[PDB]
Amino acid sequence: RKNNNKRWYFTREQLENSPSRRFGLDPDKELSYRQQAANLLQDMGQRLNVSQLTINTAIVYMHRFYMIQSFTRFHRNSVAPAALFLAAKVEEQPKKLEHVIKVAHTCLHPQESLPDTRSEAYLQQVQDLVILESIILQTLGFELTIDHPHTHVVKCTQLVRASKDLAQTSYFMATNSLHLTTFSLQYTPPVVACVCIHLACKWSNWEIPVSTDGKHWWEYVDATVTLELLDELTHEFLQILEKTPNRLKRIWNWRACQAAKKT
Template sequence: MATKLSLTNPLLTPEQWSQPPSRIAKVPAPLETQIRHFACELIEAAGILLSLPQVAMATAQVLLQRFYYVASITQFSVRDTMMACLFLASKLEECPRKVKDIINVFDYVVKRRRNLLITPLEMFSQAFYEMKNGLIIAELQLLKQLGFNVQVQLPYGLLVTYLQCLGLVHHPQIPQLAWNYLNDALRTCVYVCYQPPTIASAAIFLAARQCQCKLPTQPPWWTVFDANLDDMIYISGHILSLYETPLPTNIPLTCEELESYLENVQAPLSNSPSDQV
């Protein structure tokens, strides 16, 4: 039987939603949410410094979210995985970057985010070797754990089309605001829970509410785009939750840091919602 190529994104199963591997490994849901959020922020920062197109950064963020629904952050270093995701995404989007450049940039953005002294990473140092080895192994694990299914369909093109259909392309605020919401949603589980049409519709829904712009309801405008109101509300809630509490600077990025954090941290985790839907 011939295999059909699907142009839709693979979505989480109900079991993966409710019980990701990190939860089985006793990592608190708020901490895992913060780690995912932080890693995606670092991917975006590194991508900008590497002059990568937005599609590559977005693809890398989605791959990281997918990976940690089939693998635990206690077994696979987040630092290595986020480097591997950006390295792989740059190849998938035909804008490859050198391994040494990716390592140096991630070393820089992590130190800057943690307010550490920024010193050049020596190419033949032990630290460089460990990061290079970690990146290469993480890329192999990424492909293995995802079953080489690394295609990512993004909703940006659909967003522009939907805005045109609704006559909102020239609105002074909604297009940019909706675009920003799509970018921010990459730091949540949204892209592994819903297909692009629903995500694009949710971004418009949230932007229109923010701007107090009334859209057609007879029939509801989102039904034309195969979206569901409840799904859009869920997505909007996840996006808005990003703005509630700033991320701490001591979020662990390696398995060793995570183990130490879980053993020694005394301060309560923030009350940010879990990425379960």
């Protein structure tokens, strides 16, 4: 329509004309914000006790958000909780404003006096993400029902011979289609799922048996898909997974890092 699809997807020549780009700071910086804004989303969501799903739906709102507004006029550290908030409203595990705030605050301000609920400072804070939320809405054009790549990947898991031990190394790897890649604004959940697995099992050295009667075992999750691309992308994904300055004291390791438990 206006459009059904053309809405939230862009060309590499577009994210260069970022709207945070028409302002005085870098790409090397911006690429670096988003990952550090989603990164915050994670921390709080874990602290709030919400599904890793909601976290992801925020990360997609965030991504989708700053393709319309600069990071100069809406700082990532205050659109983050604004969106995690409206997210866990949508995916349905509500948490209440004063609950989000009280967390965000012990996120960003570890050694502070836990907030006075009556201070003009506070009754202005809440006054704000309230107005922000009206923005993060008017911005995603009220399109909050978000489709993820994990919904798909969950589809072609044991629908091939795949050791669980390395069959969910793709589930996990999807969530980076979000944290550290601009992927979610470029190609669809399917196409993007194809990648989070063709890469997942080149570290796992197990590969895909091709399906017998004349159709590839990856052409069953999306219609237009080439290795010419998927190889092209897993490059990006990796030289982006390693275009990172060793900041990977990594994302959903707080105390869920090591492969499950020994100690």
